[PDB]
């Protein structure tokens, strides 16, 4: 409801529509002139010009029909999974069944199969075991009309029916071949040569034994063997490869795999029929942990008198795993060994004639293959935690360990580490044994070092993670409650293994105080029994439509991966979800922008009211350029691999008609309203289920409290963007245009804010020259440095006044962007805008909150990330929460676990976590300093004010000299000067040199100035400042100060001349104002308009 339009948006014609129509799901105004028709397929119809609203209509009608053949046939209605495999059947797509087991995919398959036959098509249903191909053939028969002939093929074949499948299969009078695995690879020509509508595989797993198979089954759905190898010959290669666009291949269904899908062969089906075969992603999880401080066996037996039933002991080792074992038989427990007689006591598990299993670490999992057990596994214990060891002498150190020591010494060189025995060798010729495990101690952060044992322990948080996940999965829908313990007595290995769950999993492990036995054994009993109960179904499907390709990889991370699928340009990934599936997909940035030619530089004037108009983004990859008019080529390179926007917006209608709900995750400010509403209204048309989340943390909990505040789009918002990029294109044009007359160059003026920084430098270094005056330091004996007016003569400095109080010393308050861009860029010598990439790469891989903000607001969670790090580092008591701000649309920039940099630091080398640079983590460590500053108790600080006499001149300096108690001191320096004391001090030596009292500007500098003006945004800030360096207007000199260019001078010399009213600081600080007040719905959206048209109107005037 923004008066806008958007050159591709009528659902009908494909063509241009108004903002307004679009949300009314109505096509554009040529299409269908009546406002409000009465069915908008049949009014279309009657003028004549219904063209490809008739594709959405039959696809509702098509997936109708299959869902009344599916309730007529079955019981009832289908589930969640269901109905996003049944919208993907009418499209004729293929995809992996992305579900929990126990949800009937062999029941979907069956009524696919049967719902074609009724159309003619044919369909070939593949199973792995010959039983279960007589199983699903005895099941069609009775499902099926007599019209209906299906045909099926066993181990245990008769001589009569055995030659009637084999005769119709040559005469293609067949509608269903239901035949087994083993089949494919033995009749693989046969297969090829025929073209099925459907195919549907039970088990991947028994297909992809043979890579043969893969060939078989694409060739059965119709793709030819030359499309063929040519994919493979490009996946080969690397690169993706892009299918024919006219090409009509059959559905091919497939189940999700159990184990690897190793090889690159599988990657066929991603290219070819567009989508990803990888096994399930368990992330879906419900687990209490608790941690008991000792192995004891005491506590054991009371936990297992507790729980009763379902406990899966896991033992570190064979040898204290027997010993467990026979405490236990001790005790009459129906406890069973994996180690001697697995098989049978397992199976007894497995029915329930053994309450408690103890299983070992390295081999439970390997033994289990195949049978996972949801429903018996509840409680799991953990006889110590699951961690891998390194024996830390010498002649037995790892590769990793010796990486990190001989790099931090030098030793070695930063690329590939040599053979493990050459850097063995080094070690050996440099270092002592004693001294190589004290290196291990001081440089290894994250990991337990222990001296006397000679042992380096690492917990193994994805085996912890894996082993829990056995007491918590979805069984008939439900995500099942389930409880870890650990019986670990080491504190360190327990805080190390504490925040790798943290890191991983999000997750937490409580203590045995805080844990309530017998609500937790409530809870997993009683989730069990809702399990057990029809529940009937409750599964959805909701879609996530990011913006960026960093935040929906992070997504994936938390949420699972297990399929990709394909859609133009546009990758939608999937995950299995306790609430059903979600898919999500990135946008690859904006969709939609001004155009350059139509009325007043792209926004028209229709009844008096600017409509601006909007055409697709299009990115060319190969040169970067991005143009906005519909060509071919591009319109730089003239290159024809273009990133087109339009089929970005095309793939995202023909998704929304799959899934149930849908959200669109852009970041919480203005630039990311405008893309959710640009969305929104495309897909209006399409769907009525659209909303919009706020993710201020790429996180589970970042997602979760996200979607607790749900809402729809926010003009006053979107309304704000369209303003700022208004302006700046108006401004913009106008002004580089007026520059084009003088200079020739092409863009000059990127809008008013940058103007205004120009003329701030320009006007500096008159105001950096003047302001020269003659200084001279003098060292003091017992003393501190002095910096004083020249021409000081006098030898002796006499201290007059002498006052000693006590302060408790307030920290900074967290950093917002300004902050942030100021000191991070000061302290690491880098851009602003390399330092703002860095904190938008940290925020999108969902390690720091929101970076666009200007609030230092704390939110009581995010206390609680510096408690909990206080509480590990061991110094909780210096923890004083801070909220700092009550106002503020974001908080402030902090780190969202409670992990520092040297500990992130560590996990990377690991690899748990990845794409961190060295960058990243400095950036990372200040902010999580001053963040912890901001959360730590006052300094208690002892000052001195002192009033000396230099020259008769009355000097005072205000000092610290002594530190009663320590606060956030371990986080941010506080420097103690030496004390003072009534006595005359003699200048030891005198400086005499010439100091500017007023400083050049630096980038830093750049963006204080511009939070202290009023001017800039926190999502402009480092922008403004590096345009200026793009367009050679500043540079950088020896020292890092930016300083104007000689080209910089005379642009802002004619813009002073001519158009100073238009860049003067105190109209861009007023229309920034306005802006603000546009985005609380303060202002007048149109209003603002006319004053911006009033505005340029005189600018052109002159
Ligand atoms: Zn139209
Ligand atoms: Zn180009």
């Not at 936990?303 to 080792?317: K, P, V, Y």
């Not at 960026?548 to 394909?566: C, D, M, N, V, Y």
């Not at 999500?584 to 530089?601: P, W």
């Not at 607001?857 to 008591?877: H, M, P, W």
């Amino acid at each position: 409801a923004v008066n806008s339009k958007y050159h591709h948006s009528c659902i009908n014609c494909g063509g241009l529509n108004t903002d307004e129509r679009n949300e009314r799901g109505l096509p554009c105004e040529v299409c269908l002139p009546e406002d409000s028709p009465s069915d908008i397929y049949r009014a279309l119809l009657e003028r004549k010009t219904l063209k490809e609203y008739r594709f959405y209509h039959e696809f509702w009608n098509e997936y109708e029909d299959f869902r009344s053949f599916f309730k007529k046939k079955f019981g009832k209605d289908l589930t969640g999974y269901q109905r996003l495999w049944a919208k993907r059947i009418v499209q004729g797509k293929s995809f992996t069944m992305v579900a929990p087991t126990g949800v009937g995919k062999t029941t979907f398959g069956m009524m696919t199969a049967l719902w074609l036959a009724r159309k003619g098509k044919k369909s070939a249903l593949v199973f792995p075991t010959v039983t279960l191909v007589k199983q699903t053939l005895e099941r069609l028969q009775k499902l099926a009309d007599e019209k209906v002939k299906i045909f099926g093929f066993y181990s245990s074949m008769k001589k009569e029916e055995k030659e009637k499948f084999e005769k119709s299969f040559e005469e293609d009078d067949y509608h269903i071949l239901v035949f087994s695995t083993q089949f494919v690879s033995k009749n693989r020509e046969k297969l090829s040569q025929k073209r099925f509508d459907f195919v549907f595989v039970d088990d991947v797993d028994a297909v992809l034994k043979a890579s043969r198979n893969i060939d078989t089954l694409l060739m059965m759905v119709g793709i030819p063997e030359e499309i063929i190898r040519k994919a493979f010959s490009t996946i080969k290669q690397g690169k993706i490869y892009e299918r024919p666009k006219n090409l009509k291949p059959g559905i091919l269904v497939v189940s999700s795999a159990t184990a690897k899908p190793r090889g690159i062969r599988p990657l066929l089906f991603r290219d070819l029929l567009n989508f990803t075969v990888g096994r399930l992603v368990s992330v879906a999880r419900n687990i209490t942990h608790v941690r008991i401080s000792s192995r004891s066996k005491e506590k054991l037996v009371e936990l297992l008198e507790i729980f009763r039933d379902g406990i899966l002991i896991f033992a570190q080792t064979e040898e204290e795993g027997k010993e467990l074992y026979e405490y236990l038989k001790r005790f009459k427990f129906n406890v069973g060994e994996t180690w001697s007689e697995f098989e049978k006591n397992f199976e007894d598990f497995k029915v329930g004639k053994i309450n408690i299993l103890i299983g070992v670490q390295a081999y439970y999992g390997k033994l289990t293959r195949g049978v996972d057990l949801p429903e018996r596994i509840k409680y799991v214990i953990f006889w110590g935690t699951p961690s891998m060891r390194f024996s830390l002498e010498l002649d037995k150190a790892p590769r990793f360990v010796l990486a990190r020591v001989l790099k931090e010494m030098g030793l070695i060189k930063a690329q590939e580490n040599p053979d493990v025995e050459e850097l063995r060798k080094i070690a050996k010729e440099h270092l002592t044994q004693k001294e190589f495990v004290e290196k291990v101690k001081e440089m290894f952060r994250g990991v337990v070092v222990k001296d006397e044992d000679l042992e380096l322990i690492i917990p193994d948080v994805y085996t912890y993670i894996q082993a829990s996940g056995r007491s918590s999965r979805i069984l008939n829908g439900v995500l099942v409650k389930g409880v870890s313990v650990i019986f670990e007595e080491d504190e360190e290995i327990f805080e190390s293994l504490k925040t790798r769950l943290l890191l991983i999993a999000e997750e937490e492990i409580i203590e045995e105080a805080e844990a309530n036995w017998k609500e937790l054994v409530h809870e997993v009993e009683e989730s069990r029994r809702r399990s057990e109960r029809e529940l009937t179904d409750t599964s959805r499907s909701l879609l996530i439509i990011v913006e960026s390709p960093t935040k929906a990889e992070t997504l994936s991370r938390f949420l699972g991966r297990a399929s990709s699928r394909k859609e133009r340009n546009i990758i939608v990934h999937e995950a299995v979800t306790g609430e059903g599936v979600i898919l999500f997909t990135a946008t690859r940035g904006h969709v939609y922008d001004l155009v350059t030619k139509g009325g007043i530089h792209g926004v028209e004037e229709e009844n008096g009211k600017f409509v601006p108009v909007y055409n697709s983004l299009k990115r060319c990859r190969d040169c970067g350029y991005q143009f906005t008019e519909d060509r071919d080529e591009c319109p730089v390179c003239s290159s024809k691999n273009i990133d087109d926007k339009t089929e970005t917006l095309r793939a995202l209608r023909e998704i929304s008609l799959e899934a149930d709900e849908i959200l669109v995750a852009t970041d919480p400010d203005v630039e990311g309203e405008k893309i959710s509403w640009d969305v929104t209204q495309y897909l209006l048309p399409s769907t009525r289920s659209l909303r919009r989340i706020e993710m201020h943390e790429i996180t589970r909990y970042g997602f979760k409290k996200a979607r607790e505040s749900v809402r729809f789009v926010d003009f006053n918002l979107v309304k704000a963007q369209i303003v700022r990029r208004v302006q700046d294109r108006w401004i913009g044009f106008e002004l580089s245009g007026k520059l084009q007359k003088r200079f020739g160059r092409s863009n000059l003026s990127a809008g008013r804010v940058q103007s205004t920084v120009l003329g701030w430098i320009v006007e500096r270094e008159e105001e950096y020259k003047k302001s020269e005056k003659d200084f001279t330091l003098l060292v003091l004996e017992n003393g501190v440095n002095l910096e004083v007016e020249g021409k000081i003569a006098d030898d002796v400095v006499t201290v007059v006044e002498l006052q000693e109080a006590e302060e408790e010393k307030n920290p900074l308050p967290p950093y917002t962007t300004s902050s942030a861009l100021s000191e991070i860029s000061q302290k690491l010598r880098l851009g602003v805008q390399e330092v703002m990439d860095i904190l938008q790469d940290l925020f999108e891989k969902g390690f720091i909150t929101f970076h666009r903000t200007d609030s230092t607001r704390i939110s009581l969670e995010g206390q609680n990330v510096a408690r909990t790090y206080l509480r590990k580092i061991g110094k909780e008591d210096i923890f004083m929460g801070r909220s700092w701000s009550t106002e503020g649309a974001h908080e402030a920039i902090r780190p969202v676990k409670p992990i520092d940099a040297r500990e992130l630091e560590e996990m990377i080398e690991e690899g748990l976590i990845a794409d961190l640079t060295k960058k990243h983590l400095r950036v990372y460590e200040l902010i999580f300093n001053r963040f912890l500053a901001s959360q730590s108790a006052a300094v208690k600080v002892k000052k001195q004010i002192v009033t000396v006499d230099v020259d008769g001149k009355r000097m005072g300096i205000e000092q610290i000299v002594e530190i009663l108690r320590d606060g956030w001191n371990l986080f941010v320096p506080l420097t103690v000067s030496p004390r003072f004391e009534h006595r005359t001090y003699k200048i030891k030596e005198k400086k005499f040199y010439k100091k500017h009292t007023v400083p050049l500007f630096t980038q830093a500098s750049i963006v204080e100035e511009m939070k202290k003006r009023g001017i800039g945004r926190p999502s402009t800030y480092a922008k403004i400042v590096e345009v200026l360096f793009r367009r050679g207007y500043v540079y950088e000199d020896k020292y890092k100060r930016v300083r104007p260019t000689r080209f910089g001078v005379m642009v802002y010399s004619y813009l002073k001349e001519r158009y100073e009213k238009y860049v003067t600081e105190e109209t861009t600080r007023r229309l920034e104002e306005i802006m603000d007040k546009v985005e609380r719905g303060e202002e007048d959206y149109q209003a603002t308009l006319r004053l911006l048209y009033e505005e340029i109107k005189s600018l052109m005037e002159e």
